[PDB]
Design brief:
The structure is a homodimer.
Chain A (H helix, E strand, L loop, with lengths): L2 E4 L7 H14 L3 E8 H4 L1 H4 L2 H29 L4 E8 L1 H9 L4 E5 L14 H9 L4 E4 L8 E5 L4 H17 L3 E6 L3 H17 L4 E6 L3 H8 L4 E6 L10 H8 L4 E4 L1
Helix pairs in contact in A: 5-6, 9-10
The structure holds adenosine-5'-triphosphate (ATP) (4 copies) and magnesium ion (4 copies).
PDB class: unknown function
Keywords: Tandem-type Universal Stress Protein, unknown function
Assembly: dimeric
Chain lengths: 261, 260
């Protein structure tokens, strides 16, 4: 099981770096650390000796990238993790998505270099990656935190099924029980969803419990997540004005989130 | 890994039944066998009527019970942990619902409606592979052990899913994988091939590559032996002349593993 950590070396990415290393160690899984030299920054001179200016900027960005990679590589080696570092140039989300094809789990921070420590939202690189990634994406808040619990938003939709299947191995390897949350006005429908997810988890060596609720799903999922709880759910598709369930959950999440498509 | 075998008890489903049991045994994986009482058949009388429908459902349900008992007996004999499930509704619908709790589906290419000379795909198999959330393995009627594996890889999203789905299977079976990447640009195809080979090796699977040009479907079809598991992404659109996967799946000579 290959873990791919994407980091821009920013404070907001520190939690992701720590979590990826912690997971690699706990799961005895190899870790690939990726830093992308942002062409959107290097191209600024062009949007305005432009080739020279662009080269000078790329050189600075690449050197910063090498420093970040070396720092994480050093940390990972110290932890006893089999780590490899990759430095590429391009649009961050595109490069990350390309490298994701060879990974089994991605770990990114909620935000990065562009936002201060007061930002509770999601950066655009993280947003674009989770919406198009072929493999599960784990978004970690800036402040490092261990995964001490797990909950799953399950409505039996295709993506919820993928989230369910993606979560099982992680919960199993970490010894975490999973709280299945199924929300619907029809209690019989929600119950059927919950029992299904619980059966799957138990069949895969994971303890599970369920909460069959009515009302607003996003609100319930957000309120039930503790700072160390991994909240797993299907990734959003449409970009709704008021936001779909997953959009509202991911934007306001207090703890680590695992998305799957 | 939970394997879900869907069978209608027909001769065309015998291959899938055998393969599912064989895989469960080889991987020490639990097996669920599902038979669906087809409401499309039971409801024919609706075209009193309720009594006639009930009499047909009763017959269909009893056949299903017999099929499940036969398969369960075989599996239990091999030491496989098997669960039997009797459902009623539209086959592909019930199969797709049950798939949400499985990690791999095993179905025959065709079933009860076609003779032993049909090399095509039945509508239940078609609908299931196109909408399944988990990998679907389509097995020919004649039972055959998987003795090899090939992967059609063009780095597309579904090809990536197929690649990730195949790895655990090839590993457990000790089969090497021949990666086939096709494109007019040799460099692009090689990059694709190398990417898949690297993933497979990183997951304990030996791999080789065939970088080709020309028609992808033709190459994939021609390279598949009767015992080779051909893994590829499931089709999306229903093209008039058929997309690559549509053509491969329709004419495949051996077992196919689809993912999406
Ligand atoms: N250049 C990069 N290289 C590698 N990973 C990156 C890069 N940029 C962002 N990431 C990953 O995406 C996560 C979110 O960063 P993101 O760029 O989306 O937020 P932001 O930088 O604060 O706002 P924005 O980039 O939209 O202006 C980071 O914590 C990191 O894991
Ligand atoms: N009622 C619910 N109960 C529990 N979890 C839910 C519920 N609704 C949504 N979710 C979670 O959120 C994920 C995505 O739901 P969401 O409706 O936001 O995406 P979508 O429906 O697939 O795309 P779209 O917003 O375009 O319809 C689901 O896969 C599931 O994990
Ligand atoms: N009633 C059923 N219950 C369980 N599995 C089924 C059922 N019907 C079909 N299947 C699965 O689907 C595979 C393909 O059968 P399919 O129904 O698609 O071909 P067919 O019956 O010959 O043609 P058609 O059903 O379109 O008239 C079967 O081998 C079996 O694995
Ligand atoms: N050039 C190729 N080389 C190797 N394998 C291929 C190639 N093209 C397609 N495939 C295989 O066939 C699968 C599906 O390809 P296909 O083009 O038929 O589906 P699609 O492109 O995703 O949907 P659509 O036909 O609507 O565009 C891929 O995931 C891949 O495994
Ligand atoms: Mg950024
Ligand atoms: Mg929805
Ligand atoms: Mg049929
Ligand atoms: Mg295609």
């Amino acid at each position: 099981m290959r873990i791919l950590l994407a980091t821009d070396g920013s404070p907001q990415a520190r939690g992701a770096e720590a979590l990826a290393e912690w997971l690699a160690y706990k799961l005895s899984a190899p870790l690939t650390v990726l830093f992308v030299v942002d062409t959107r920054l290097a191209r600024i001179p062009e949007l305005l000796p432009v080739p020279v200016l662009r080269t000078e900027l790329e050189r600075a960005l690449a050197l910063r990238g090498e420093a970040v990679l070396e720092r994480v590589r050093q940390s990972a080696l110290a932890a006893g993790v089999a780590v490899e570092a990759v430095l590429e140039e391009g649009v961050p989300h595109e490069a990350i998505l390309r490298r994701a094809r060879a990974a089994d789990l991605l770990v990114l921070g909620r935000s990065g270099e562009a936002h201060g420590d007061g930002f509770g939202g999601l950066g655009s690189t993280a947003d674009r990656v989770l919406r198009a990634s072929p493999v599960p994406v784990l978004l970690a808040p800036g402040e490092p935190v261990e995964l001490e619990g797990a909950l799953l938003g399950y409505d039996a939709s295709e993506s919820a099924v993928r989230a369910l299947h993606a979560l099982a191995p992680l919960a199993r390897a970490l010894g975490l029980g999973v709280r299945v949350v199924s929300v619907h006005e029809d209690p019989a429908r929600a119950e059927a969803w919950a029992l299904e997810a619980e059966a799957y988890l138990r069949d895969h060596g994971v303890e599970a419990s369920a909460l069959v609720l009515g009302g607003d799903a996003a609100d319930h999922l957000l309120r039930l997540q503790g700072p160390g709880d991994l909240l797993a759910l299907g990734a959003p598709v449409r970009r709704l004005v008021f936001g779909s369930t997953a959009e509202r959950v991911i934007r306001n999440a207090q703890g680590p989130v695992l998305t799957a498509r």
